Design a protein around this ligand. Sequence first.
Ligand code: HEM
Length: 354
Amino acid sequence: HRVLHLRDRLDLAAELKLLCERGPLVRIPLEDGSAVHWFALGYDVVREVLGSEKFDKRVIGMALPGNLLQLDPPEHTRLRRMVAPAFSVRRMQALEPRVQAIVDDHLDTMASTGPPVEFLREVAGPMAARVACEFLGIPLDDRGELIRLTYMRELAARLRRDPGDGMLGMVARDHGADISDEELAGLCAVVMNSSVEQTESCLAAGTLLLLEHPEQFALLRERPELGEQAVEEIVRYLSVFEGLDPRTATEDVEIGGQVIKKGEAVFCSLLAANRADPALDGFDITRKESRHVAFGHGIHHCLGAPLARMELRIAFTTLVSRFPSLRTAVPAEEIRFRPPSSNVFTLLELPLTW
Ligand code: HEM
């Protein structure tokens, strides 16, 4: 369903805009009669689908342990409840100064190398990866290699036998016998993946978005208290996680005024839900409350959202303050974005100068 990923730079492609005009829930019977699929395109219907207990995440026509996105209740609940305490408000507050210092480290490297910089590979990527290591509690001597590769079972088993700090230590200390080596390794892999894919892309493309709106780049500098609002507006506008794994109805269920039959698959487009409403779509960090589903909704709602929200706030606020003269080293119109795919949305490189 490639149409759900068609963009014009950061905005929706006309072809996808045209599709959204067909209403927030669109029935898509396959041309071969093999199935009936649905596109959930509106904010309310996407929330209705994702909150419903009447859908599962069955495979339809690689499964890895510790991957919450491939579990349904009650197994999903069992694993999620064991890892959830790593993201409490208490734990992000304890972690904030150390994340601030990691961000400052990478912006120190940037200011010393001097311009230009390829911001994606040289700043955003490493920053996101290093924050992930700190959150996870990766031992210092493993971080360089772990990041270079993005082994995991060997790493997870060793840390499990001697709990450290961070999320992995907490999990092994409090649930050592209830989580296997492969499941702990799977958690580690998802966190690294979500950091070097989703978070890195938000950092790089969000910097571009701010640079394309220099009034707001500067506003965040003069009013850093806007950081939290800025993050919500950035993740809404970017929608780097564009479309979700299908939800299959386990029984007939009425959604958005239509009957989704047992066995039919619903594809939620976060991109469309976040962007298709022309009314209030303009990028504006002074919006006090953003209407978006950039982190999903329901039992699979992004487990890392507290970390992502804190890391992005720290990164963007510090960046605009330390580099008021930042600008793209090429015209914004020349930036390459990855072509339509179910993979995370990202630009391919971001040359910056200052
Ligand atoms: C800007 C960055 C991020 C965005 C936009 C994002 C987005 C999302 C979305 C939309 C989902 C729901 C997928 C679905 O329901 O099919 C999700 C799930 C998840 N995310 Fe994030 N994510 C981000 C960063 C992170 C980070 C930093 C972590 C670190 C732990 C993380 C861990 C997870 C996990 C484990 C799940 C699965 C939860 C479950 O199935 O119960 N993500 N993410």
